[PDB]
Amino acid sequence: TLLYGANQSSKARENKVATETRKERMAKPTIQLTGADSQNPPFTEKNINDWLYKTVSITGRPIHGKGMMIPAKSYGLHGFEYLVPFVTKENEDGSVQEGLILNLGFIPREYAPIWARARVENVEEQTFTCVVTDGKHLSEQGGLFASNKPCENQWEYADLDQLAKHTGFVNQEQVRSCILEHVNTETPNDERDCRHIDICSDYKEDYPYKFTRSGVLQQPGQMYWDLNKSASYYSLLGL
């Protein structure tokens, strides 16, 4: 119990340092990616630490047909994180495509199926301002006795290799490297903002709801205050 509390306190301190680092990274102005630079993004498995948790603005075309729905909960709503294969470069026939994985934000459980929406999704070239992110807490959310079923759209955690295989893009390593979380950079950069998706109380926005700069910094349930509370509780239990 005391050992567990000490470990929780150490993890809280490490998470605080990581959150400060991510805030410093995201405070920088967005890096533009248009034209050929979008078709050959600088992100790679080896250089990812340079661009990790860093705001870029990349142009490309999203594929809403093959969207993955990673289970997630946002403000008491059980919905899905809406990952899509983001196509940057492709040949005229369309057989050969390369791109990335784009987290469009939280989409409620009711509207997750394509036939459940009153829209025909736009799959043309669009510019998205996204934070390049490792995609860590999504990959560590499945828990025990949970596993993804691909070859169908069944997901429990963001397994980067399985998502990359599902995308079918040729540049498998770059797709596996990271995901780009659709973010709104006109929001406060503190992790205490307590508005994690770019919405209002009346939810007047349109699904999926993009993240605020505080939402990207937010690890659900593992922030330093939660770990400090857990450490205090376990210290009290032990003593």
Partner 1 sequence: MEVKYRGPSDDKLECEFLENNLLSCLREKSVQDNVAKMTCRPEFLVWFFLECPTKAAVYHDPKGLRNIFIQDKIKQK
Partner 2 sequence: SCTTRRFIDEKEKLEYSRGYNQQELEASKLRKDFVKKYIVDFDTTLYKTQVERDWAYIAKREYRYEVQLKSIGYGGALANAVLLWRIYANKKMVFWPIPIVGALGYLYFQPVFFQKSNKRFFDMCNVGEEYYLGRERNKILRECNKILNVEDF
Partner 3 sequence: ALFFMANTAISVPSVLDTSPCMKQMLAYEDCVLDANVPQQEVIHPQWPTIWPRLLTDGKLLEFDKVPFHPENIYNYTYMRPLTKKNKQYLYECEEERFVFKACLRKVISLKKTDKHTSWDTAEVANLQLT
Give me the residues that bind partner 1 (CB under 8 A), please.
204-206
What are 66's two structure tokens?
A: 């093959």
How far, in Å, CA of 180 to CA of 66, rounded? Answer: 17
Length of the chain equals 239
Residue 201 is classified by DSSP as T
202 binds partner 3 (CB under 8 A): yes
C-alpha closest to that of 129 among 203, 50, 186: 186
- Least distance (Å) between residue 19 CB and partner 2: 12
- Binding pattern for the stretch 143-182 against partner 3, x by CB under 8 A and - elsewhere: ----------------------------------------
| C-beta pairs of 72-78 under 8 Å, 24+ apart in sequence | 72/106, 72/138, 72/141, 72/220, 73/220, 74/106, 74/196, 74/197, 74/209, 75/196, 75/197, 77/106, 77/108, 77/109, 78/109
- Least distance (Å) between residue 118 CB and partner 1: 9
Size of the site for partner 2 (CB under 8 A): 14
- Least distance (Å) between residue 213 CB and partner 2: 16
CB-nearer residue toward partner 2: 27 or 225: 225
Among 2, 27, 77, 236, the residue binding partner 2 under the rule CB under 8 A is: 77
CB-nearer residue toward partner 2: 134 or 226: 226
Give per-residue burial for 195-233: e unless 16+ CB within 10 Å, then b: ebbbbeeeeeeebbbbbbbbbbbbbeeebbebbbebbee
188 binds partner 2 (CB under 8 A): no
200 binds partner 3 (CB under 8 A): yes
Strand partners, 183: 211
- Least distance (Å) between residue 203 CB and partner 1: 9
3-state class (DSSP) for residue 90: strand
Query: Does residue 182 contact residue 211 with C-beta atoms inside 8 Å?
Result: yes
CB-nearer residue toward partner 2: 76 or 94: 76
- Least distance (Å) between residue 191 CB and partner 3: 15
195 binds partner 3 (CB under 8 A): yes
Binding site for partner 2 (CB under 8 A): 75-77, 192, 194-195, 199, 201-203, 223, 225-226, 229
Binding site for partner 3 (CB under 8 A): 195, 199-202
